[PDB]
Amino acid sequence: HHWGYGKHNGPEHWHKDFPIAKGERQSPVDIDTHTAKYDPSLKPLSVSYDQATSLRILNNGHAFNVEFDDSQDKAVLKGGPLDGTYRLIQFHFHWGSLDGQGSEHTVDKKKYAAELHLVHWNTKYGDFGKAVQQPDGLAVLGIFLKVGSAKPGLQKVVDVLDSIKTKGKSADFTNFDPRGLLPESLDYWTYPGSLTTPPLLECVTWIVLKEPISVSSEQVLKFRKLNFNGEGEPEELMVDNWRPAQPLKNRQIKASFK
């Protein structure tokens, strides 16, 4: 009876195995655009993905993960609100059963069809497992998806999903360029928070881009054909793999833009 997104093991249940679920800096949150303070001291985000080396894509029974070789200082996030350099280790998405839901962060209570997370770890802690034990261990870049025009840079991802339909399936996924998933503007909101899945560790500097990317209805329909279950188990579509907004508590959301 492991965690998931269903009636009996979904987010309202997680606190039993992961009591930090009711903690002081949980994610995601609603971004109230009128209350977010413009912070002129915030730097432009530095997204250096020219040398990114993807290796593999994986269905872990909750999402699909595109994994990167983080053995060298290649694909790095720095600047913005961050001190030092954070290395890209994987990206994944959260999405809905319908276009009206699927994002984890909300903007003035607006839900997007999906949300892309690019997960980076702080090089001062040497690896991902040690970083998640530190309050400044991770930087997650969050990008909203809306349904409209296709995102050509997403299609290589959509086309491999047939090969990883069920939990535990993986595929070689080399030479994928995550620059093709970025919107034009790097204007962002930032706040201190957590992983949005168990173990829900309070180790994340969230950086959420204001500008969504557009993906086609056909692209997001192929996300919704994935399965939470393993090969040869009853079919449960992988949809609504999002945690709802959590209480902001004693936190300030800062805006990089006026």
Ligand X SMILES: C[C@@]12CC[C@@H]3C(=C1CC[C@H](OS(N)(=O)=O)C2)CC[C@@H]1CC(=O)C[C@]13C
Detail the residues annotated as belonging to a binding site.
92, 94, 117, 196-197
Round the CA-based radius of gyration of the chain to a whole number and report it.
Answer: 17
How many whole angstroms separate alpha carbon 42 and alpha carbon 23? Answer: 26
- 34 part of the active site: no
Does 131 engage in binding with ligand X (CB under 6 A)? no
> With CB cut-offs between 5 and 8 Å by kind, which of ligand X, Zn ion, none does residue 119 bind?
ligand X
Does 196 engage in binding with ligand X (CB under 6 A)? yes
Among 31, 57, 82, 119, binds ligand X (CB under 6 A): 119
How many whole angstroms separate alpha carbon 220 and alpha carbon 99? Answer: 9
Catalytic residue among 1, 2, 62, 120: 62
Among 26, 59, 101, 197, binds ligand X (CB under 6 A): 197
Does 120 engage in binding with ligand X (CB under 6 A)? no
Among 25, 87, 111, 117, binds ligand X (CB under 6 A): 117
Using alpha carbons only, give the angle 106, 107, 109 rounded to the nearest 5 degrees. 65
Among 65, 85, 246, 256, binds ligand X (CB under 6 A): 65
| Rounded alpha-carbon distances, angstroms, from residue 210 to 19, 76, 145, 168 | 31, 20, 11, 33
Cβ proximity to ligand X, 107 vs 119, nearer residue: 119
> With CB cut-offs between 5 and 8 Å by kind, which of ligand X, Zn ion, none does residue 59 bind?
none
Site for ligand X in 69-108 (CB under 6 A): 89-90, 92
Does 26 engage in binding with ligand X (CB under 6 A)? no
Q: Where are the alpha helices (DSSP H) in 85-207?
A: 128-131, 155-160
Element (H, E) at 222: helix 217-223
Question: If we measure between CA atoms, which residue out of 144, 222, 139, 147 comes closest to residue 183?
Answer: 144
Residue 230 CB contacts under 8 Å (≥ 6 apart), including other chains: 61, 166, 167, 168
For residue 236, the cross-strand partners are none
Catalytic residues: 62
**Residues found near ligand X in the complex (CB under 6 A):** 65, 89-90, 92, 117, 119, 128, 140, 195-197
